[PDB]
Structure 1
Amino acid sequence: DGCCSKMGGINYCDSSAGRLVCNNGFYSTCYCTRHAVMDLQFLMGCCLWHGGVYPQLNSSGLVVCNDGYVSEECSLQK
């Protein structure tokens, strides 16, 4: 997990742009906070682009999102 390797080491983590600063004056490659310009191109969880998971307690295998659409792709079949 060497972020400033072949550098002067780690100076501190900037909180604005969320990047480490090495001891030489370069913005390092690593992140240093969760609020960063950081690309995400893949997601998990069901009911995506919908109302999310409805909080009901269904004994049946169907789970229906909060927009009312049923996610059979996550709902287990008979």
Structure 2
Amino acid sequence: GCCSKMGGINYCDSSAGRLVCNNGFYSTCYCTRHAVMDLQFLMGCCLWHGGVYPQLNSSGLVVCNDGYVSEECSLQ
């Protein structure tokens, strides 16, 4: 229930990425992925590098695109 205690969902305003309720109030829910979200925690390894280099290794080593070796995703 996004527009709860209101008249229900009117439509998705994609210019702001938000739902509009049946009154004149903007909803708190998102309906597009291009909406302003305060993202602070992101998953995956080789972050703040070029990403995971897609070669397949005989060992369990994970290498980033800039030559760095990620010890967290590397198997011991």
Q: TM-score, normalised by structure 1?
A: 0.94
Which 5+ residue runs of structure 1 have no aligned equivalent?
none
Deviations 1:55-78 (A, max 9, x none): 10102011110000000111011x
d(CA) in 2 for partners of 1:59 and 1:15? 47
TM-score when scaled to structure 2? 0.97
Q: Tell me how far 1:29 sits from its aligned partner.
A: 0.7
Unmatched runs of 5 consecutive residues or more in structure 2: none
| Cα root mean square deviation, aligned | 0.6
- Displacement after TM superposition at 1:23 (Å): 0.4
Question: How far does residue 39 in structure 1 lie from its aligned partner after superposition?
Answer: 1.2
- Deviation per residue, 1:14-42 (Å, 9 max, x gap): 01100000000001111111000111110
| 1:30 is aligned to 2:33 | no
Report how many residues are paired: 76
Structure 1 distance, partners of 2:71, 2:37, is 32
Spell out structure 1 runs of 4+ moving beyond 4 A. Answer: none
1:21 match: secondary structure: strand
Percent pairwise identity: 100
Aligned to 2:46: 47
Query: 1:64 is matched with which residue?
Result: 63
